[PDB]
Structure 1
Amino acid sequence: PQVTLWQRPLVTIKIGGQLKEALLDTGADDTVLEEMSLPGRWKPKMIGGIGGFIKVRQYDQILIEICGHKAIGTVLVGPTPFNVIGRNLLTQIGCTLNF
Structure 2
Amino acid sequence: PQITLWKRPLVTIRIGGQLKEALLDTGADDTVLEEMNLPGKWKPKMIGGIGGFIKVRQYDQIPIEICGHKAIGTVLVGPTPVNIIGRNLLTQIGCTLNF
TM-score of Structure 1 vs Structure 2, range by shorter chain: over 0.9
Unaligned runs of 5+ in 1: none
- Structure 1 residue runs of 4 or more that deviate by more than 6 Å after TM superposition: none
The aligned residue for residue 65 of structure 2 is 65
- Cα deviation, residue 16, structure 1: 2.4
Deviations 1:33-90 (A, max 9, x none): 0101211111001011111011100000000000000111000000100000000000
Normalising by structure 1, report the TM-score: 0.97
Unaligned runs of 5+ in 2: none
Q: Paired residues, what number?
A: 99
Matched residue of 2:14: which SS?
strand
Normalising by structure 2, report the TM-score: 0.97
Percent of aligned pairs with the same amino acid: 92
